[PDB]
């Protein structure tokens, strides 16, 4: 009780707080999915620009 700071039970436990890990997994999947597309676009642009000028 003294260490928790709560007289009833722990806090930040529960599916409302546990689900955030799975939300992070999904968010990271989406973020990498979009970042790969953006990196491919930028790489195509750079490979065009350099070999046209350089």
């Amino acid at each position: 009780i003294y260490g928790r700071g709560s007289l009833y039970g722990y806090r930040f436990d529960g599916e409302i707080h546990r689900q955030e890990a799975q939300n992070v997994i999904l968010y990271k999947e989406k973020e990498a999915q979009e970042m790969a597309v953006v990196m491919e676009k930028l790489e195509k642009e750079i490979q065009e620009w350099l070999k046209t000028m350089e």
Binding site: Y2, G3, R4, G5, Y10
Partner: protein
């Protein structure tokens, strides 16, 4: 209210009751004669103080770490 037979415990004749055995040479063993063998805890009281302190402290440590 009640007849004398119920009060005195017999209708006609008072029956002899077998007395209680004593077991000479040793202490009586009954539900009320157990403090002869089991006194209140008196040997590990200071250890109780120490262990209560350490239990409180360790519980608080791990609970705070879990919460944080």
């Amino acid at each position: 209210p009640l007849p004398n037979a119920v009060v005195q415990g017999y209708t006609s004749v008072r029956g002899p009751k077998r007395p209680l055995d004593h077991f000479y040479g040793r202490t009586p063993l009954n539900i009320d004669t157990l403090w002869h063998w089991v006194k209140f805890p008196h040997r590990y009281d200071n250890l109780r103080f120490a262990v209560c302190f350490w239990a409180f402290l360790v519980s608080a440590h791990f609970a705070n770490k879990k919460q944080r």
